[PDB]
Structure formats: C-alpha cells, structure tokens
Amino acid sequence: LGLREIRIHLCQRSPGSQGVRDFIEKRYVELKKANPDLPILIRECSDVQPKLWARYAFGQEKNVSLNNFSADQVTRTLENVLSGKA
Amino acid sequence: QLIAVDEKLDITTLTGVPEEHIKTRKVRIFVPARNNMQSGVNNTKKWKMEFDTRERWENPLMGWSSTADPLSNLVLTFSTKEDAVAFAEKNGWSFDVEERKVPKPKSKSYGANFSWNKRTRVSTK
Amino acid sequence: TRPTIRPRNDVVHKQLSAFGQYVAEILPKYVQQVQVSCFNELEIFIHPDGVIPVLTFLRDHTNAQFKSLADLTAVDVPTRQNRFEIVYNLLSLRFNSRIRVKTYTDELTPIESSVTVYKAANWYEREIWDMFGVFFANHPDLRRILTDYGFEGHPFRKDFPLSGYVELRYDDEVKRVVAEPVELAQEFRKFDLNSPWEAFPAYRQPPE
Amino acid sequence: LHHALIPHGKGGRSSVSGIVATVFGATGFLGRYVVNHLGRMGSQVIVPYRCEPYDTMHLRPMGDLGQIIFMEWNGKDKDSIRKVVEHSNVVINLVGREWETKNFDFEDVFVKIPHAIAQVSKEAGVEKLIHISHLNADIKSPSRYLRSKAVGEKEVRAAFPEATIIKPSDIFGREDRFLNYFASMRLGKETVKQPVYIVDVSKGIINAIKDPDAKGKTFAFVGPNRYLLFDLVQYIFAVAYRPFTTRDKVERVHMSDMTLPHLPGLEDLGIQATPLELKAIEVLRRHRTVKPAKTVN
Amino acid sequence: SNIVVSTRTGEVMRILPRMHEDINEEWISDKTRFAYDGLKRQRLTQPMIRNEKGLLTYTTWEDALSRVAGMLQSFQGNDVAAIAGGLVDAEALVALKDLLNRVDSDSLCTEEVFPTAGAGTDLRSNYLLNTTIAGVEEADVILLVGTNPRFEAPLFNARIRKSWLHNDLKVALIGSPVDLTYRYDHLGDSPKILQDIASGNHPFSQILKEAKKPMVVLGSSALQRSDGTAILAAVSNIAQNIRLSSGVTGDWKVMNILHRIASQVAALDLGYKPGVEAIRKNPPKVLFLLGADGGCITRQDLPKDCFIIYQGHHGDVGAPMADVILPGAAYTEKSATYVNTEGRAQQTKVAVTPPGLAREDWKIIRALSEIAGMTLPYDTLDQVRSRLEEVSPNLVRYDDVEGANYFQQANELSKLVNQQLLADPLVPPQLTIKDFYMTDSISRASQTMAKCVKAVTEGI
Amino acid sequence: GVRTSPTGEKVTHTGQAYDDGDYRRVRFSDRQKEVNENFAIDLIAEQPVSEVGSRVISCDGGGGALGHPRVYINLDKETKTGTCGYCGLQFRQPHH
Amino acid sequence: GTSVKPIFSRDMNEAKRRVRELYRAWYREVPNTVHLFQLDISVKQGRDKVREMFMKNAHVTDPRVVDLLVIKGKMELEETINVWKQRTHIMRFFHETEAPRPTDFLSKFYVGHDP
Numbered sequence A: 001l002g003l004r005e006i007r008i009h010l011c012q013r014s015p016g017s018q019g020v021r022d023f024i025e026k027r028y029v030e031l032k033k034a035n036p037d038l039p040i041l042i043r044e045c046s047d048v049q050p051k052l053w054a055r056y057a058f059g060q061e062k063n064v065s066l067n068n069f070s071a072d073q074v075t076r077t078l079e080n081v082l083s084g085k086a
Numbered sequence B: 001q002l003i004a005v006d007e008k009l010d011i012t013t014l015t016g017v018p019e020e021h022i023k024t025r026k027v028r029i030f031v032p033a034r035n036n037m038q039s040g041v042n043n044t045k046k047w048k049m050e051f052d053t054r055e056r057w058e059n060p061l062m063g064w065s066s067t068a069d070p071l072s073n074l075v076l077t078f079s080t081k082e083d084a085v086a087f088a089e090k091n092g093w094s095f096d097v098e099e100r101k102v103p104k105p106k107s108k109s110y111g112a113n114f115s116w117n118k119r120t121r122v123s124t125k
Numbered sequence C: 001t002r003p004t005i006r007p008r009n010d011v012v013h014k015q016l017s018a019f020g021q022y023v024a025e026i027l028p029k030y031v032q033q034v035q036v037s038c039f040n041e042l043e044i045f046i047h048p049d050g051v052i053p054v055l056t057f058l059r060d061h062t063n064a065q066f067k068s069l070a071d072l073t074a075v076d077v078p079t080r081q082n083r084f085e086i087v088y089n090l091l092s093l094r095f096n097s098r099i100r101v102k103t104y105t106d107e108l109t110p111i112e113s114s115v116t117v118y119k120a121a122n123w124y125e126r127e128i129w130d131m132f133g134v135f136f137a138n139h140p141d142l143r144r145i146l147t148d149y150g151f152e153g154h155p156f157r158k159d160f161p162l163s164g165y166v167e168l169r170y171d172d173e174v175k176r177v178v179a180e181p182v183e184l185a186q187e188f189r190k191f192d193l194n195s196p197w198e199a200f201p202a203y204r205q206p207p208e
Numbered sequence D: 001l002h003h004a005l006i007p008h009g010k011g012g013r014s015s016v017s018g019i020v021a022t023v024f025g026a027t028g029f030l031g032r033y034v035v036n037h038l039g040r041m042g043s044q045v046i047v048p049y050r051c052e053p054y055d056t057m058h059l060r061p062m063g064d065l066g067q068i069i070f071m072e073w074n075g076k077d078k079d080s081i082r083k084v085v086e087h088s089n090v091v092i093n094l095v096g097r098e099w100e101t102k103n104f105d106f107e108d109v110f111v112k113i114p115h116a117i118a119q120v121s122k123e124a125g126v127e128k129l130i131h132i133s134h135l136n137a138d139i140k141s142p143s144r145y146l147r148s149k150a151v152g153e154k155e156v157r158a159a160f161p162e163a164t165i166i167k168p169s170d171i172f173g174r175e176d177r178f179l180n181y182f183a184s185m186r187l188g189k190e191t192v193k194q195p196v197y198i199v200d201v202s203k204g205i206i207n208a209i210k211d212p213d214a215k216g217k218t219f220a221f222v223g224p225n226r227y228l229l230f231d232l233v234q235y236i237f238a239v240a241y242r243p244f245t246t247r248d249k250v251e252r253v254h255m256s257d258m259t260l261p262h263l264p265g266l267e268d269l270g271i272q273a274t275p276l277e278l279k280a281i282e283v284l285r286r287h288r289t290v291k292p293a294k295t296v297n
Numbered sequence E: 001s002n003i004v005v006s007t008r009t010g011e012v013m014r015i016l017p018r019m020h021e022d023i024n025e026e027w028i029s030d031k032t033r034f035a036y037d038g039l040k041r042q043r044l045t046q047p048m049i050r051n052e053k054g055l056l057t058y059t060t061w062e063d064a065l066s067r068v069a070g071m072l073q074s075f076q077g078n079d080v081a082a083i084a085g086g087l088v089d090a091e092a093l094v095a096l097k098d099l100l101n102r103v104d105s106d107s108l109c110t111e112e113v114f115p116t117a118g119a120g121t122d123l124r125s126n127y128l129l130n131t132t133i134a135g136v137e138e139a140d141v142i143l144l145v146g147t148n149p150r151f152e153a154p155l156f157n158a159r160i161r162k163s164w165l166h167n168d169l170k171v172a173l174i175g176s177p178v179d180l181t182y183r184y185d186h187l188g189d190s191p192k193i194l195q196d197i198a199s200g201n202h203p204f205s206q207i208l209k210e211a212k213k214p215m216v217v218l219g220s221s222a223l224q225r226s227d228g229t230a231i232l233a234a235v236s237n238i239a240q241n242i243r244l245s246s247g248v249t250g251d252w253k254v255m256n257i258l259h260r261i262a263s264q265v266a267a268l269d270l271g272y273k274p275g276v277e278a279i280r281k282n283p284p285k286v287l288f289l290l291g292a293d294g295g296c297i298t299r300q301d302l303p304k305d306c307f308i309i310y311q312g313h314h315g316d317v318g319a320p321m322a323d324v325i326l327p328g329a330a331y332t333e334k335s336a337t338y339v340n341t342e343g344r345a346q347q348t349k350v351a352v353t354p355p356g357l358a359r360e361d362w363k364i365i366r367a368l369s370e371i372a373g374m375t376l377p378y379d380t381l382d383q384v385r386s387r388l389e390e391v392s393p394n395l396v397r398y399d400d401v402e403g404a405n406y407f408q409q410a411n412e413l414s415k416l417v418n419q420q421l422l423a424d425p426l427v428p429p430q431l432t433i434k435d436f437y438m439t440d441s442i443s444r445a446s447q448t449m450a451k452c453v454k455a456v457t458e459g460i
Numbered sequence F: 001g002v003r004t005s006p007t008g009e010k011v012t013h014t015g016q017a018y019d020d021g022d023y024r025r026v027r028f029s030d031r032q033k034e035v036n037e038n039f040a041i042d043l044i045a046e047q048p049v050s051e052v053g054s055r056v057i058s059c060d061g062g063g064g065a066l067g068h069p070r071v072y073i074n075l076d077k078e079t080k081t082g083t084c085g086y087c088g089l090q091f092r093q094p095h096h
Numbered sequence G: 001g002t003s004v005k006p007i008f009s010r011d012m013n014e015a016k017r018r019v020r021e022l023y024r025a026w027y028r029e030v031p032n033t034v035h036l037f038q039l040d041i042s043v044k045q046g047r048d049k050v051r052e053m054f055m056k057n058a059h060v061t062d063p064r065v066v067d068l069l070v071i072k073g074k075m076e077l078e079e080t081i082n083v084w085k086q087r088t089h090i091m092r093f094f095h096e097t098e099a100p101r102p103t104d105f106l107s108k109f110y111v112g113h114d115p
C-alpha cells in the first residue's frame, strides 16, 4: 500500500500523448510542489501507448493506459494512484 | 497449377541445423566499419551477417584455442539490408540490424590555409 | 599486347554471338539472356520451365547437336530471392563447340529432371540434391550419393559451417561408432584477406 | 582452484573438466568403463600399469590428445605410487584379484596395496580418494576374500579419513565374471543375489567424484531386484537358448547378498539402477548359436 | 566513442576507433586506445569468501551465492543498500534495483553526486548534454563552468576545438585556468561570478545576450563539491535569463550537463539516487558494491559486522573490504547497454568471454535472486531488455539522441531551496595531464598507463 | 644460456616453466622436456660491434641472396649503436 | 496472392494424407528393424522414437515444406529397409552417449556462459 515511485511514459509527437504532455507543461510543477519526496519519473515512449506505472512496496507494480486522455483525466488518474483509492 | 498459399516463409525444419543453434543464436546484420589503419573504402560496400561470439578456451596440450560452437566462422554477404533480413527471417534466426554509416560530405578549401583574418591559417605546410 | 597477355580470338567471338542470337530467336518463350565472355564462352539464361525443351533442342537440332553433357552443377548465392542457380555444360562434337545453360530455383521449387534428355544427368542431379537440397521432379531414384547415411543438412550451402555439426568416434561402453556435437581442439583460423583499394575498375558497380 | 584446473568447454572430448584422476587397476573390467567415462568429458587420466602396454592399448582412443598418460608401477614400491599420484586431485582404487597368486595373496591385494595407495595419496595432498570394497565384506566372513576386503576398508579409512568407500555386489556386464561365468558351466533355491549393472557403477563413481558431500561416506551399489540363485541361473540359461575359481568363488557365490538399508546407494547419487532384464540379452547374445525369473522384494 | 576490439584466438590484441560522425568522428582517446592492457591484470576469476582466519579464499558459486542469499533473506528494508560504480551496465543496474526492491529497499546509490533538489532526475533534460556533441558545431558562444573538458571528455573538447577553429567559436571558462589547446576568455575562479552573470553586472552577460546560439556547459566535477545545488541553480538562472531576454530562438536547448563516468546517465534514468548520502543517513547492515571502487564508503561509515558484497572484474580498493567476492564481466566480455552524456544509449558486443568462473553481471544477480527465493521475471538478455523498456523506454533505442525539453519546469523547481555558495574556487580534479591516465580500475591496472604517468612526471 | 626452475625444470629461451601447482608437469614423468640449449639472445650478444667510416651502412646478413633483405642503417647517433632489424648485428662510427 | 508451384500436394489435406502413409510405413517397419539389426531396444521405444521424430515437425503449416519432409522421411525409410545403414546409424537416433543437458537457469549458470 506504500507508494514508492511513479513513472509516466509519454511520446513526443503522437496525438494520443497530447493531453499528457499538456498536463506536464501545465501542472507537473505543482504536483512536485505537493510531493517533494515522491519520484515522478518522466520518460519517452516511441510509437507506443502512453502509460502510467506505479510501484508499491516489495516491488509490486501496476500500470494504466493514458491513450487519448486529456489533462483532467490524467490528473484524476494520478490523484487516484496517489490516494490509493480504486 | 498454383497453390496460392499466403504465409511467411520458414525453412527451419529442412536445413538440418540443431535445435539450440536456431533459437539461441543472435545474428548481426551490418555494413562493416572501415579499418582505421587504411584509407580505402572498398571493404565498406556490402552487408554482412555474423553470429554472436561464444566461448573460446585453451587446449591443455599445446595451448591452442578451442571452440565448441560450429558457427564461429560463418559470415554471409548480401547486396542490401533487405536481403539479409529475408535470409535471417526464413532461416529462423533472431537478428539485430544496424543502419549503414556514411561519411558526411565535407567542405575543403586549399585557399583557407592562408587566411587574412580567420583561424584556419596554418603555421606550417 | 606483349607476351604476358592472353591473346584473343575474334572469329570465335563472332560465331558464338551469332549462334546465341540464333538460339534466342528460335526459343523466345524461355530465353531471357544471352552472353559471350571475353574468353569466348557462350551462356544462355533461361526460365526454369524451359529446362526440358531448350536442352532437347540443343541436343537434337541439326544446327546444334550438343550431344554430350559435360557437367551439371549448382551455385548457392544467398543474397538472391531464388537462392540456387543450375548450370548445364554441353559439348557438341559435330561443330567442336561448347555451350552453357543457366536457370534458377529456390529451396521449395522443384526443377524438372533432365535424365530423359541426357542419361548422364542422373548422378549429377543426385549430387545436387545431396549438396544443395534442390529437388528434381520425375527423377528415377533421387537419394543421397556423397554424404553419410542419415546425414542432416546440405553441406555445399553457404550457411552450412565448414566443420559441420557432428563428429564421429568409437565408444567402448556401447561398443560402436557414435556421433557427438563437434568440438575442435584448435578452431579454424578465419583470415580477413580482402584489401580495400578495389582492383578492377571495369567491374565497378554504380554507387546507388 | 588453480586456474589451469578451472572447467572449460561444453563437457566434450576436447573440453576441460578440471579433474586429474589416477586410476589404479584401470586395465580390468570396471577400469575401462571408469576411464571411458572420465575421458569423454575431457579429464586428464593417469593410468598406472604393470602388464604389457599391449594390454593397455584399448584405452588409447578413450581421450583426446595428451589426456591419457600411461606410467609403469608395481604395488610393492611406494616410490612408483608417489610418482603416479603426484599431480592428481582424485585417486581411484580399482585394484583386485579374484584368486590367489604366488606373488600376491589376498592380503597384499586388498590390504597392503590399498593402504599404501591411501597413505601416499594423503602425503601427496590428493584431495579425493575413492576405494572399492565388496557389499558382503565383514570381518567374520568364512572367505578370505571378504575378510581381507573388510580389513582393507578399515585401513583405508584409517589412512584417508576423507575417503569415499563404494561397496558393490556382483557386477553384471559385457566383460563380467557373473553372467559369463554362469553361462560357461555347459545348487540354489536358498541363495539370494542382488546384481548391479557395470555402467551404473561407473556413473556412481563419477558422481561421487563430482558430489562435494560424499567425502567420508560409504556407499552400497546394488541392483533393483533380488533374485534367488536357482531362478537367476534358469533365466540366464533361457536367455542363451540352451538346455538347463578353485574354492573361494564357489563359497562367495553360494552365500547370500547382505542388506544394508542404512547406507546410501545409487539413488543418493542421482542414478536409477538398470534392471538385469534390459542387459541380459546384450551380455549373453554371444553365447547363442521374456519369461523373467521370479523376484523377491 | 565507438570502437573496434581486435581479438585473436580468444585474446584482445588492440583497440581501434570506429567512425561515428556524431560522437567521436574518427578519433579515440589515449586512455581508450591503450588502457586495454589493464584487462589482463588483477582480474577476479573465482568466487571468494572469508575463512575462519579472516582471509579471502576461493569457493564455488553455490557456496558464495548461498551465503549472500542467507543475509539477503535475514535483513530487509533500510538495512540493505547498494552502490553502483562507474563501469556498470544498465542490465545489471536494473537487475540489482529489482532485487533490492523485492526486499523493500530503495537505497540504490551511485558514487557520482547529482543534486536531487527540485526536479532532480525526474526530468531527463535536467542532467543531459542537451545540445548534443554535434550541436557544438552550431553554437557561437560557449561558457564552461567548473570543468576540464580536455581530460574529462577528450572528444568533446576536440569538437570544441574544431568549432573554435572553423566556426570562430567564442569560449569562456569559469574555474581554474587550465590549458585547453585553444585560447579562451578566463572570467575568474569564484562561483560568485556566475551570480554576477546571473544578475547582469558582468559584461559576459551582454556577450551571452547578443548570441544567437549560446551554450552553457556545467561539469559533474563541479557538482560533487557540496555546492552542486547552488551551482546548478546559478547556471539554470543564467540560462533562463538568456532565454527570457533573447527569446525563444527555436529548440536550441542552451542548458547542458557534462558527465564523467559511463554508468551515470543509465543509473539516473533507472531511478538510482545520485550520491551516497542515503547510506550515510541510514547505515546498512548488508551492502552491495556493484563495481564500486571510488572508496567513498569505508568500513568506518558502516556498523560493526556489516556484510559487504563486491561484484566486479578487478581487484581494487573495493575487493579487500568485502566478505564475499562475485567475479563479473568487463565491458569487452558482455553485450551491455551504456548511455553517454548526451542521453544516447548504445550496446557493446562480446569480444571474448570472461576468464575463469566469472559470469555476466545481470546473470549473477538473477541467480542470486533465484537462490534467495525472490526469482526475477526475466531469464534471457532479451527479457532483461524488455524490463529495461518497461522501466525507461529510452534504453532500447540504440542510436537516438532527441528528447523533450523540460527546462522551464526544472528552472521553476530549482528556485525553492536557497542553498548558499561557498567561498571556495572551482578547482577541477584533472588539473594536468598526469592526472588523466589513471581514473578507473582498468586504468589503474594498466602498465601502459603507468608508463605514461612515469614519462609525463619525468621525461627523457 | 639455460636456467633451472626452483622445482627443477629447465627454463626455455621464451621463459616457459610450469609452476609448482601445475598438474601438466605430469606429462614429463618417465620422459624428458625438450629444451634447445643455444639461446639466440646470448649468442647475438657476443658478436663484436663492427666499425665503419660512413654515416650509413648496409646489411644483408651475409651470403648475399642467402641472407635477409638488404637494409640501410643510420649511424648519426653516438649515444647508441645501429642494429640490423633482421640479423641483430651492430654497427657504429669510430668514436674518438 | 503469391502463387507457387506445387511439389506433390495442392493443399494441406493431401500433405496430411502423405504424412499418414509415411507414418504407417514406419510403424510397420519398426519391428523388422529391431530384429534385423539385433538392436537392444524394444519395439515400443522404437515406435515411440518414430512418433517423437514425427512430432518434432508438427508445427509446419506449409504443404511444400511438409511434402519435402515426407520425401526425406521416405528416403530415410528406404535406407533403413534396404539395410544400407548400419547399427550405428540406427542407434544415432537415441544419443545414448551424450551427457544430459540441464534446461534450468541455475545449472546453465553454473556450467558456463552458454545461454
């Protein structure tokens, strides 16, 4: 139940990652303001779906898809992951 | 008179190659780099297929170099990268392809050796 | 052209070019190319479907009578879509001449057997099947002729390794000769002999 | 581990297994199989011989070039033993005679020679020693063979505490003296026999060499099935298609094979014992020109 | 730099440059060329354990792996930690990270320090040479801060020299006045000069304002000096002033970080914590040394009877302090992924196999995980690369250098903490050529490097 | 100039000798180790230095076509002597 | 598309019928091979080996490959029936001298560098 790190794999040019990119360029800083000790890694996919990876204690990982998500949708998904609610 | 079958070509079962020398090897498809000791480029024209390097050990008598993999000296030549990919695919070998490296065109000017105000002026010739 | 250079014969060159054009005119259904080399050797490149007609013509026509089959063999070129090229060498005693016929196939396309045209082809075709894996249709008895019984693979293929995959020894536990995966006390030494600085400008390929 | 003794290759003829083995009694029945097993994986084998080299010629093709080294020795001298085992990391003792000779009685063959081998090997720093005794070796045996076997086993243990003792029953194989001896006769119903295949014993010796935990242990190599002597001989004669060695062998063959459940066997060394019904034809086919015997478990 | 290893009968004979127009053109460094001699000396060949006397003695893989696995099972959480050295590949890095995560440990550290305040390693461009090596040929002004590119990155300095010669590039340096083989403008030694440039008092601020393609390069050696946060903040402030005053010329990517070791960028990509401070805060009782030979952690900084495992290929300062030694493979003996200072991932190929009982490093970690009851999902090199793709998908694109620019976010996050600068001039570690030959365990084992050091120290 | 190992084996001109822990020594038991007694380095070290009154000398190893390829050696350096790259013979100008 | 010249079979069913004919012939021949070569194996394990060698190629979905395999198997059967092979050739199918190779990751780790 203890979150350790999260990973956002977004693509540079594909339209499906568009909203995700927006989220970063709009809100990532504020997120890093609220969570100064959580590693939020941002990495680059290529011709792949956007994805969000969440790592919990003892190496368990869960991933969710971010294809065609808007900034509001990715914000909601990230709040759900951070809070732990299903 | 024509089957008109639609499937990817696979001749693995007909070549007599042992099972573990098909799905365990990794072939490399590449244009060999020019030997830096020389200037000739005639050895950088064709595509090569070569297998992964395996263990070499010392012969207890005479200290020679001994191997146990039969494909250690197998190098194939191809006109294009597509030919090599087709051969490797039909033979059931997993491959890594590297794109051809080409020297970029350079601007050469002998007159720049003797420059009024640039740094290209040479101190000796 | 002083004494170290091979002399050339223009009369034979002209004669072979004329006979090549003649053969191409007579059999346009199968002939794709005709060539005469600088040392006066004529080769005819044909479609695989014309192996039996063309050969029959060259054996039976009054102006050819190539009655002797000197050699039949195959060449493996992995870079081509059709891997194997099949080469027929024919000798005519009536006109004291030689000719070469080439065709092509891959690992899965049968080639017609020419034993009905030349009896000599029989063993040659067996050898081809033994060494390259080319199947010949309507062969009286096609089977291995050079390799050991139960030998796997076709050793004259380019991707076949030089020392093969198995070696033989005598085992005293089972009291017989057994086959095991090959292990060499000294690996064959691969040499990189080709130099840069191309040797022959006349054969330079376009830089594409 | 002395880099020159680090294993290399794929465990084949020209591989290096890291085993330097001195095999005493390599010119006999079990020795040829042991040397073949050692040499097919690329170990270095030192063969001491006292016979003519002609009698050792059949061991030459058993290893790669240089992997089999023949040296002369005699059991009465400790210097030859020392020079034969100087460079080995494992020593195997297969020395044994099934009869008494004017120059070597049972005491020299089974007590003095093994004791000398063990003592010299311990002095030379040999890491592993493997010694073969009999399954039915006990001190109070009516036969001098098994009595000397037991005494020699005790003295080998005294000289080499880390020695591995392998005790086997009658061994049946292509060059044996069990099946061939029973087929050359051309009493029972109370003697029980437990024969073991030769290849099983060879693999057991090899795995004991390779097993790091079989240092001071004692093993008993026995077959899967126990037969009565009468029915075993009946089966032997049936397989040959034919109608149904002074004193010590008779008394040893009339006695029953002991049972030692507390001792580890072939299964502890990862070997499945081959039944006699699979190899009887192989051994006895040369005696010619299905109805297997009843077993007691 | 791309190279060709020449081998014969299972032995490395020499190293030659392999042509890459974007990285090293046609040249290599003297260390790159001649330090292969060190691969033949002080090599780890067999597993080793401590005997009852306290001395390292040989043993089998089974015994050493069982001893390591027993302690891995006994301890967990913050009691387990690992340090990664300068020659470690991405496969072994991700394998060790997964193994320590399976025991609920997050203290995966490197010896090279990068400031973690602000964005840290969350934004890749925060720790990359964003202009790329080739992009130096397009710049018209460059500012070097606290680095000696001549000995830290010889081919990068060669590219700077080429641009200086052919493009009339203007070069200025903050730090000690080293010899760079070209004439540059020394602005001084004090870090406070950056502040002046960040404020606009210094005339070089006007020089940078007029530039069309300005470039600022900061070395990691200036980041190791405990001022790294403040130094990075000042450089980011200068770059932000440039972008704000001169506007957005394009995707020029002014900011740059020049790295020194080959394993740092892959470790930062995979989520390793840069620096070894987390070990100091929470001393562990089981410590993994993955080729770590910088000596930044001694047995004094660890509790009594700490279990130390060294995995590597050379016997150096890291091996004699360890309880268990696991012999790994050198870079010429494996197919491994390394990411250079630009963020470009490249793979090596097997030239020879490891000597003795040495094995591939990720295979060692996987075997250890299986023996310890924590088997990792991957079994082949392809599956390890699939895991690498899952963790950071830029590690499987093997010649790509293009990436996103998140400079604005990093610059906004770098303004939170206000660490002060020290009154201590920037002094690079590679002051002169005699300090260039011996930098890693392979170089220190090289007899040719020893000859070079001797010749430069006294010449004949 | 042959030497002996601390074990007792002869050391070849290439410096080869099995160490004490090497099992391979067993190949020489009841046999011998083939060693060439004439060391070429010591034999070429005994040749006198030839004196020539020229700055450049030529060497072909003696015997004309039975020697080695003909090479030219510069003798301007007085610190050392010129040495043939095939034969090992030495040349010098008459210093003092 | 991709029209190709047949070897013997127009589709998969004819190839399967030829495969079944070849398998029937091998199954009939096995006891004769065991008796005539004086082999030390049983008829049961000989037929098991025949079945295993047939199942090794069970993944092929191309009729040309299938009937080339059938041609090769018929060649092998003709070699066996005419006693052109020796006992060694017949016994080579069983690899009774080759040491067992572990498929486990740990064992391959222990023995060497080969994956």
Ligand SMILES: NC(=O)C1=CN([C@@H]2O[C@H](COP(=O)(O)OP(=O)(O)OC[C@H]3O[C@@H](n4cnc5c(N)ncnc54)[C@H](OP(=O)(O)O)[C@@H]3O)[C@@H](O)[C@H]2O)C=CC1
Binding pocket: D024, D025, D026, D027, D028, D029, D030, D031, D049, D050, D051, D075, D093, D094, D095, D096, D097, D098, D104, D109, D132, D133, D134, D135, D167, D168, D169, D170, D171, D177
């Ligand atoms: N029934 C069986 O086969 C089983 C065997 N036993 C034990 O297993 C061991 C080996 O068995 P096995 O192979 O069948 O026996 P063998 O008779 O076939 O050979 C024994 C070896 O010991 C050598 N040897 C015998 N006497 C002397 C001697 N006085 N000096 C030097 N060498 C000698 C022989 O060499 P050479 O020919 O030159 O004389 C021979 O090579 C023996 O110790 C035996 O007692 C264990 C249970 C039963």
Ligand SMILES: [Zn+2]
Binding pocket: F059, F060, F061, F068, F084, F085, F086, F087, F088, F089
């Ligand atoms: Zn000379």
